[PDB]
Amino acid sequence: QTAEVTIEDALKVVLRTALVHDGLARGLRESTKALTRGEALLVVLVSSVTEANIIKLVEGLANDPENKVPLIKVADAKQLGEWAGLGKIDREGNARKVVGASVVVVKNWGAETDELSMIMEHFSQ
Amino acid sequence: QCRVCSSHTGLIRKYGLNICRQCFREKANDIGFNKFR
Amino acid sequence: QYDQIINGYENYEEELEEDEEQNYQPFDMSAERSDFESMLDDFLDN
Amino acid sequence: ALPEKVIKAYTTVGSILKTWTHGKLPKLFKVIPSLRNWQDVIYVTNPEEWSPHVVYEATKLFVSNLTAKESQKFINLILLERFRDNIETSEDHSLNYHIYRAVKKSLYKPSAFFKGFLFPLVETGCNVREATIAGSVLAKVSVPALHSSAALSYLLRLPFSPPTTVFIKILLDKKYALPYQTVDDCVYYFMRFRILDDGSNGEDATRVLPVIWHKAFLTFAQRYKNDITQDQRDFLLETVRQRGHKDIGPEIRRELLAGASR
Amino acid sequence: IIKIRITLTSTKVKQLENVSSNIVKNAEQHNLVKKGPVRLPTKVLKISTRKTPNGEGSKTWETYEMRIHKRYIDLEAPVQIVKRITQITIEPGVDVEVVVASN
Numbered sequence: 413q414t415a416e417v418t419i420e421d422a423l424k425v426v427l428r429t430a431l432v433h434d435g436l437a438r439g440l441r442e443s444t445k446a447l448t449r450g451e452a453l454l455v456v457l458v459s460s461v462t463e464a465n466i467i468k469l470v471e472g473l474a475n476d477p478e479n480k481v482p483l484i485k486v487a488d489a490k491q492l493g494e495w496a497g498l499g500k501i502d503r504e505g506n507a508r509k510v511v512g513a514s515v516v517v518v519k520n521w522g523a524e525t526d527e528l529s530m531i532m533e534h535f536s537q
Numbered sequence: 538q539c540r541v542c543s544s545h546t547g548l549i550r551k552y553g554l555n556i557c558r559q560c561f562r563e564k565a566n567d568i569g570f571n572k573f574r
Numbered sequence: 575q576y577d578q579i580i581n582g583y584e585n586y587e588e589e590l591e592e593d594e595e596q597n598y599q600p601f602d603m604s605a606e607r608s609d610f611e612s613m614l615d616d617f618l619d620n
Numbered sequence: 621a622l623p624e625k626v627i628k629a630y631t632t633v634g635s636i637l638k639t640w641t642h643g644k645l646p647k648l649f650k651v652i653p654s655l656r657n658w659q660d661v662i663y664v665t666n667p668e669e670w671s672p673h674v675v676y677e678a679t680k681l682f683v684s685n686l687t688a689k690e691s692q693k694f695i696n697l698i699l700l701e702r703f704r705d706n707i708e709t710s711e712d713h714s715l716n717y718h719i720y721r722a723v724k725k726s727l728y729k730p731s732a733f734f735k736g737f738l739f740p741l742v743e744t745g746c747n748v749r750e751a752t753i754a755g756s757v758l759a760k761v762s763v764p765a766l767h768s769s770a771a772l773s774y775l776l777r778l779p780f781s782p783p784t785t786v787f788i789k790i791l792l793d794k795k796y797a798l799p800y801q802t803v804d805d806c807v808y809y810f811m812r813f814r815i816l817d818d819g820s821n822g823e824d825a826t827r828v829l830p831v832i833w834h835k836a837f838l839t840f841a842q843r844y845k846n847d848i849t850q851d852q853r854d855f856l857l858e859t860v861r862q863r864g865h866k867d868i869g870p871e872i873r874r875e876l877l878a879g880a881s882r
Numbered sequence: 883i884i885k886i887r888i889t890l891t892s893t894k895v896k897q898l899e900n901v902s903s904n905i906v907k908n909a910e911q912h913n914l915v916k917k918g919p920v921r922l923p924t925k926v927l928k929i930s931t932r933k934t935p936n937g938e939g940s941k942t943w944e945t946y947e948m949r950i951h952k953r954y955i956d957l958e959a960p961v962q963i964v965k966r967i968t969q970i971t972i973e974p975g976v977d978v979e980v981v982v983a984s985n
């Protein structure tokens with residue numbers, strides 16, 4: 413469905429603070445295995461991943477989702493890597509560069525419970 | 538070993554006390570063994 | 575991030591009391607793994 | 621009460637695990653992490669009468685197979701116990717190397733370690749030996765910046781003692797990225813030792829502070845001089861003025877003055 | 883109605899005889915039937931110890947000692963008299979024992 417900027421930013425900060433809570437699965441494989449075991453409480457998929465194959469497989473389970481499968485889209489790959497600790501680590505004075513991720517799962521919420529509840533309930537519409 | 542001074546040697550393993558003779562001679566008065574004769 | 579974890583470090587006895595109050599369960603064999611007594615039988619037969 | 625099958629099988633396995641030194645662990649001891657009640661079952665095996673080998677390997681197995689709270693319960697009820705027992709009952713008061721490597725295997729999960737090992741240790745008669753040894757453990761092991769910052773912020777709020785200052789010194793020598801709140805707890809800790817002339821002092825105000833407090837103050841002022849405000853820096857340079865060291869005082873003051881506020 | 887046997891063991895005879903005469907006179911001054919404080923032989927536990935500490939000089943020998951004395955008194959009284967007397971008579975050095983059976 414139609415993705416807004418508030419939704420995507422609140423989402424990347426959800427990945428940011430639920431990353432600290434030791435509750436993420438950062439990668440295509442770890443997130444697909446996260447969704448096969450019923451461990452994904454919310455999944456984040458990047459809207460700019462070049463190869464569409466694995467996505468054409470995840471977009472078949474996105475258009476027809478299960479009762480325990482909520483998803484949501486972000487804007488870029490390198491940045492969704494960044495908020496998951498990967499991609500980049502940029503704070504007021506410090507910087508460190510890695511490479512960006514395609515999809516990331518939130519297994520344990522913790523410090524972002526009401527935020528992932530809001531994000532998942534506004535994607536219900 | 539002697540449960541006082543890290544010593545494998547001198548062990549009085551009798552009665553389950555396991556103190557080497559040197560330390561057991563010192564702790565003798567606190568245990569109950571006193572000099573009579 | 576931090577405000578979440580320090581309330582768990584500084585009050586770990588109270589959070590252990592609340593986790594042990596909410597999530598304590600007595601020993602139930604049918605609520606473990608169901609192939610567990612299969613392993614009790616597989617080990618005790620050498 | 622437990623089934624007599626569990627009783628006899630794990631008293632047998634508890635007689636096995638007294639002398640076990642190599643090869644594979646018993647099959648009944650590796651299916652305990654998978655139990656909903658692993659703690660009623662792990663007691664029949666008799667935890668205090670395992671060999672150091674089984675301590676190390678059960679540490680590996682249970683801290684790598686259980687959850688955070690379960691790893692914490694394990695490291696608290698068995699590992700901390702055996703640690704203190706082998707340090708206290710030994711005769712040069714040293715720790716075995718397998719129990720040690722086990723502590724090093726319990727610091728792979730820093731939340732379980734800190735909440736279950738370090739914190740119930742420091743608050744139950746942590747002497748200089750157990751903290752020389754556990755201080756060596758923490759000084760050797762790499763711990764995430766968040767759990768390190770939280771453990772630091774816990775050790776700062778603790779009553780002053782030379783071991784706890786050894787620990788705070790060690791976590792400050794890490795030189796990681798602490799949140800501004802952790803650095804706040806640091807500045808408050810190093811603030812509580814100054815003498816308030818307005819009529820409000822504790823014992824930390826006039827007590828004799830070791831080499832370790834001035835070294836920890838030095839490393840703090842060395843790594844986090846740009847992450848304190850002007851006010852907190854003035855409070856800390858005040859603590860330098862009153863409670864300063866002969867050689868370290870001027871260098872802590874110099875490390876506070878050479879910094880930019882946030 | 884309880885018929886009880888008491889046995890004391892001690893190394894210092896003054897405390898042991900203090901407790902013994904105390905229990906005797908306290909048991910008769912409130913009218914009880916008893917067998918007086920019978921005195922078991924003082925066993926003298928000795929430990930042979932070499933004179934030589936460092937391997938200098940020939941080998942000659944020595945001896946350490948302990949004297950252990952044991953007494954016993956038989957009584958007949960209810961539950962309360964036994965409880966109270968056992969709580970009141972507790973002394974250091976002297977070890978008291980209260981047995982109820984007569985088999």
Ligand SMILES: [Zn+2]
Nearest residue numbers: 539542557560
């Ligand atoms: Zn000795």
